[PDB]
Design a protein around this ligand. Structure first.
Ligand code: K
Ligand code: K
Ligand code: ZN
Lengths: 96, 130, 50, 96, 393
């Protein structure tokens, strides 16, 4: 079954060989990809810098929702305390 | 103390109190694509050039409520736009379907794997689709 | 207290965004120079002995 | 006193955001809701210790389970107990 | 080489202003060592309150820093230690009875719920402060959840479980030749000194109380081994030292270190068990006496990283930390505390003051003269060779 081993080595060597032969036009592709990434990061439209800014925004706003709900609860707490204390003062003054 | 609640509590503590070995951390199935970091999902959808929107992470999905409906995120993700993200389950189902239907036969899956593993440290190598 | 933490939320967002952009710029320009070096290293016909 | 009370007051904040969101969603989204460990925020330890403080050091496990699997049934029910002990404990504290 | 003087009014100099980055994480106060333990993270939270209500947040930038990762912890600690910290809970302690015995765990350093998360917060704040200081963003970087300076590379020691200052200085050293560390706790800063003992790139300087005390180390003759000889300064002191004494000892030591060692990144531990009224320390320092150290270390003008430490009477740490933070912003605060959610804890007159007692000072002009002369002598073998062009530190 060494034929399988020969096939696989031939294919991997084929990949190495193709890359080395095309190695000069498989190197301007890299550099155009890189130059466009650079010029698109400099503007803001980069497909990856525009996909994580939106998560940093999706996580900033849950913050403010939590802040507002918490302030609502805080005010409810203060009101409950104020109401109880006023009731106690008046009622027990009259009892006295 | 009634021969039922006893072993009930016993099972509870025997299942929740362990030595936190990394060998017992619950691992998800490989076919359930919702448990995939949501950057794997975006890279899959972006590589096979599928036609979906991006997903709502988890903060953008709990941001949806009558109070949350007044934040910039809701009003930028729910009005009439094309970038309207969606729930992770939808994108994950699209990805799962394109995974179970598009298919592969070896003789080119393996040699590519070997060339990839043997060149991990290399910056200049064969990009197997890019 | 709620006014102060409002300010804190917005300052933290600004920090994380500017870090994001500087880090992505640095990563791309790293990969460029590594590509350059690995390209020229395929041009050697006779290596060094030691 | 400050420790137990101000540790209750953060689980309150989290469960409050989650209930505000649950009240604005359909029935299939109610049967298709699940929360990761951490319930969607930074910490992964405080809410569990709160839950076994308020409920039981042994049966709080089942509540945390049903809190991860069924957030739509289980956590408008838990939030109404944290709010009860908040007021009880703050009563005792401003007494002493 | 020491003459005692009166203690002068602390006062901010206008020729230098900083860009303070303050690090806080609303989770930290939520952890508790146990029933009666003297260590209470809640005090950090309390200090935050005053910072908010004094209007002090409006001249600095307040950040949550991401928690530190396991492999950032293992830059100084071992794998077995950190793995133990990550796996141990108050519920399964019975299955770690060896490791607890082996890592110094159980009475002075117990295991509570949230130990690993608390450690993550401390370490993260310290390393992010250091990194932001390296990037030329801020000048001062404050992190009061960090400063657990008693922890060993493989052992829990003295209420501390993770040495975040070591990680911070390791990150500061990537871009700096020479880093100074000042430790004005009442205990000896022994974890950091044991960690950087055989090197010359970190100079540790402790001002502690030597006696029948804790930890038991840090003599006047412990000055470094190997190439680190003369790069470890100890100032042992006796009970009762007060503001005038302390200032006259503290200023010339630090000034000679700055002239000779020429460091150009200072870390400052601002522990608070060295205040009058503390429940473990035994000094007699005021709030102005404890803050004049900060003011002096700041009057030099090199990147500072201020951290927390001790302080076991919550009220006094809270007040002195808030006052110090106001001083880093060139602001001398007002003495009447504003109403805040902790408008207790501040009996009996509700002011920004820490009051000294009348207990007796057991330190006299000859013991101190001898100590400071020995130190000034040890501290002249630590300069830079004449041909070594610097960057004006
Ligand atoms: K010290
Ligand atoms: K040293
Ligand atoms: Zn101490």
């Amino acid at each position: 079954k060494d034929k399988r081993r020969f096939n696989i080595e031939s294919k991997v060597n084929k990949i190495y060989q193709n890359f080395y032969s095309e190695r000069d036009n498989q190197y301007k592709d890299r550099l155009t990809a890189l130059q466009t990434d650079l010029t698109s990061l400099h503007q803001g439209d980069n497909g990856q810098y525009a996909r994580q800014v939106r998560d940093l925004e999706e996580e900033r706003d849950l913050e403010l929702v939590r802040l507002r709900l918490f302030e609502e609860y805080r005010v409810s707490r203060s009101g409950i305390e104020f109401q109880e204390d006023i009731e106690k003062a008046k009622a027990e003054h009259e009892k006295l | 103390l009634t021969a039922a609640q006893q072993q009930y509590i016993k099972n509870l503590i025997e299942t929740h109190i362990t030595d936190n070995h990394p060998d017992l951390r619950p691992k998800s199935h490989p076919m359930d694509f919702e448990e995939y970091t949501d950057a794997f999902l975006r890279r899959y959808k972006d590589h096979f050039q599928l036609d979906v929107p991006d997903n709502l992470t988890l903060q953008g999905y709990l941001l949806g409520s009558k109070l949350g409906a007044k934040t910039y995120s809701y009003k930028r993700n729910t009005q009439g736009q094309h970038d309207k993200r969606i729930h992770k389950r939808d994108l994950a189902n699209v990805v799962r379907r394109h995974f179970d239907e598009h298919s592969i036969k070896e003789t080119d899956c393996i040699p590519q794997f070997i060339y990839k593993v043997k060149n991990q440290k290399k910056k200049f190598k064969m990009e197997f689709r890019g | 207290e709620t006014i102060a933490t409002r300010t804190f939320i917005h300052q933290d967002f600004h920090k994380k965004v500017t870090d994001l952009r500087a880090r992505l710029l640095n990563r791309t320009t790293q990969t460029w120079y590594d590509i350059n070096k690995e390209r020229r290293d395929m041009d050697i016909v006779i290596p060094d002995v030691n | 006193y400050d420790f137990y009370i101000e540790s209750n007051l953060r689980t309150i904040q989290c469960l409050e955001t989650i209930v505000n969101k649950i009240e604005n969603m359909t029935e299939n989204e109610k049967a298709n809701f699940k929360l990761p460990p951490g319930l969607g925020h930074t910490s992964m330890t405080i809410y569990k210790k709160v839950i076994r403080k308020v409920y039981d050091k042994e049966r709080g496990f089942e509540i945390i389970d049903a809190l991860h699997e069924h957030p739509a049934v289980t956590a408008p029910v838990v939030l109404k107990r944290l709010k009860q002990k908040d007021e009880e404990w703050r009563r005792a504290q401003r007494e002493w | 080489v020491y003459e005692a003087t009166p203690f002068d009014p602390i006062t901010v100099k206008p020729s230098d202003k900083r860009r303070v980055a303050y690090f806080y994480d609303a989770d930290v106060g939520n952890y508790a060592y146990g029933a009666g333990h003297p260590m209470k993270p809640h005090r950090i939270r309390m200090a935050h309150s005053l910072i908010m209500n004094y209007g002090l947040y409006k001249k600095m930038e307040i950040y949550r820093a991401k928690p530190a990762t396991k492999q950032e912890m293992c830059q100084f600690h071992t794998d077995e230690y950190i793995d133990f910290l990550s796996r141990v809970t108050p519920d399964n302690l019975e299955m770690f009875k060896r490791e607890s015995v082996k890592f110094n765990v159980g009475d002075d350093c117990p295991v509570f719920d949230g130990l690993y998360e608390y450690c993550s917060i401390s370490g993260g704040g310290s390393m992010e402060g250091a990194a932001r200081l390296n990037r030329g963003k801020c000048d001062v970087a404050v992190n009061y959840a960090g400063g657990l300076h008693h922890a060993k590379k493989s052992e829990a020691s003295g209420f501390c479980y993770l040495n975040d200052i070591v990680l911070g200085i390791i990150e500061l050293l990537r871009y700096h030749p020479r880093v100074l560390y000042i430790d004005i706790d009442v205990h000896h800063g022994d974890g950091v000194e044991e960690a950087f003992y055989t090197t010359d790139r970190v100079m540790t300087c402790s001002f502690h109380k030597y006696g029948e005390f804790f930890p038991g180390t840090g003599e006047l003759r412990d000055i470094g081994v190997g190439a680190g000889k003369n790069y470890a300064v100890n100032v042992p002191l006796r009970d009762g030292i007060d503001d005038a004494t302390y200032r006259s000892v503290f200023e010339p030591v630090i000034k000679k270190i700055m002239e000779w060692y020429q460091p150009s990144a200072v870390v400052l531990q601002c522990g608070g068990d060295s205040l009058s009224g503390d429940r473990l320390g035994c000094f007699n320092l005021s709030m102005e006496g404890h803050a004049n150290c900060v003011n002096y270390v700041k009057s030099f003008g090199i990147p500072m990283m201020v951290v927390g430490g001790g302080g076991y009477t919550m009220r006094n740490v809270a007040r002195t930390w808030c006052f110090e933070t106001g001083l880093l912003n060139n602001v001398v605060l007002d003495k009447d505390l504003p109403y805040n959610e902790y408008y207790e804890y501040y009996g009996p007159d509700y002011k920004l003051s820490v009051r000294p007692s009348n207990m007796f000072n057991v330190n006299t002009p000859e013991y101190l003269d001898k100590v400071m002369t020995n130190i000034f002598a040890n501290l002249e073998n630590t300069k830079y060779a004449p041909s070594v062009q610097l960057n004006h530190t």
